[PDB]
Amino acid sequence: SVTSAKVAVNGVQLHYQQTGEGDHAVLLLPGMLGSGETDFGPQLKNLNKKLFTVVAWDPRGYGHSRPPDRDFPADFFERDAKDAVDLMKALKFKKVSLLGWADGGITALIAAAKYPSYIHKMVIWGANAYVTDEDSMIYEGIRDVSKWSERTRKPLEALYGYDYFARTCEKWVDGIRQFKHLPDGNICRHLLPRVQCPALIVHGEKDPLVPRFHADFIHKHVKGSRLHLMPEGKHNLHLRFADEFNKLAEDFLQ
Ligand SMILES: [Mg+2]
Ligand SMILES: [Mn+2]
């Protein structure tokens, strides 16, 4: 049983889905153009409702957190990180664990580093702490949504309508590529050493969007972190291999 609602946070009405009665609060952070509805169905359904209280939020401009429309200023990951934590605080949780996917994992890393007393544990996958030429090329190949597979386009087209979906994807590409021009193509390399909570980095070895060196790098600089490789996992491993992933996550969080 899942409840959808909005809460006022930093000038925006953020949408989120909540389920479970557990004492361990968990926030699910979606990736680019994502939402709880499109990125975390299996988790909102199967994560242990007795152990956890699960919340899946929609970053401003994504999912149902519209208005406003999405924009990508240089600090957009930090803005999302603040919104995410403020949302959970608005919902009265005293401490929470984070499950972040891709852009959501980058967001989770930032939140753990900036608000260490609020984060218990963290599980991230498909995230990159910086942008390289190889990444830039990958992003460019994603820009045109019309060339996306029909299966991956359907859900987002239905949620946003073609126009917003196409336009926001282009702004995302320009928004994430902007980091390549900064020293070290940095997004959050500098915050990794500041993560103080136990972290589990999962990586699908067949992920075509995020080279494994990004997971190795995050693992290297996040003290006490654990890295788990899934031979058959791709970028959407928590969806394609939901049962396997959920077990990995639940075991780590306990
Ligand atoms: Mg450097
Ligand atoms: Mn939503």
Curated annotation (Swiss-Prot):
Specific alpha-amino acid ester serine hydrolase that prefers small, hydrophobic, and aromatic side chains and does not have a stringent requirement for the leaving group other than preferring a primary alcohol. Has homocysteine-thiolactonase activity (in vitro) and may play a significant role in the detoxification of homocysteine thiolactone in vivo. Catalyzes the hydrolytic activation of amino acid ester prodrugs of nucleoside analogs such as valacyclovir and valganciclovir, converting them into their active forms (acyclovir and ganciclovir). The gene is BPHL. Changing H235A: Complete loss of valacyclovir hydrolase activity. GO terms for molecular function: alpha-amino-acid esterase activity; serine hydrolase activity. Its EC number is 3.1.-.-. It is found in: Mitochondrion. The keyword Kinase does not apply. The modification N6-acetyllysine is found at K49, K82, K89, K154, K180, K206, K223, K234. Mg(2+) binds at D184. Its main location: mitochondrion. The modification N6-succinyllysine is found at K89, K147, K154, K223, K234. Expressed at high levels in liver and kidney and lower levels in heart, intestine and skeletal muscle. GO terms for cellular component: mitochondrial outer membrane; mitochondrion. Pfam families: Abhydrolase_1. The record marks D103 as: Binding of alpha-amino group of substrate. Belongs to the AB hydrolase superfamily. Lipase family. This is Serine hydrolase BPHL. It is an enzyme of class 3 (hydrolase). The active site is at A102 (nucleophile), D207 (charge relay system), H235 (charge relay system). Residues 25-144 form the AB hydrolase-1 domain.
